[PDB]
Amino acid sequence: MGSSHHHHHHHHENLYFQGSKRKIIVACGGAVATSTMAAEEIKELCQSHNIPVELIQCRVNEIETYMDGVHLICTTARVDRSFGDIPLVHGMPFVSGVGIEALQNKILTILQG
């Protein structure tokens, strides 16, 4: 009927959306409200302006290993950011839970260019 083709059962395939555009990493630890705050915050923001991206989380020593296709890195003061051009940043004020509002504006300003 066409030399093996067209599946009636089901085309259970796996899409590769591990790119989109940019990929960021978050390094802190486990879950102490701080992590859930950033993830949710960065997610809501990324979607607020419809910015397709993939947010990944990692420990203090994982971003380097998973640094295959990361466009931005977020470490809580640990890395040196002096190797190559790893676009990482420290959310010191973001963790404060008070300086996020003001900082957020700054992040978006540069994020848009």
Swiss-Prot record:
PROSITE patterns, sorted? PTS_EIIB_TYPE_2 (PS51099)
Compartments annotated for it: namely: Cytoplasm
Sites where Phosphocysteine occurs are at C28
Catalytic residues at C28 (phosphocysteine intermediate)
The protein's name is PTS system galactitol-specific EIIB component
**Which major enzyme category is it?**
transferase
One GO cellular component this record assigns the protein to is:
cytoplasm
Any Pfam family hit: PTS_IIB
Encoded by which gene?
gatB
Q: Which organism is it from?
A: Escherichia coli O157:H7
Q: What is the lineage of its organism?
A: Bacteria, Pseudomonadati, Pseudomonadota, Gammaproteobacteria, Enterobacterales
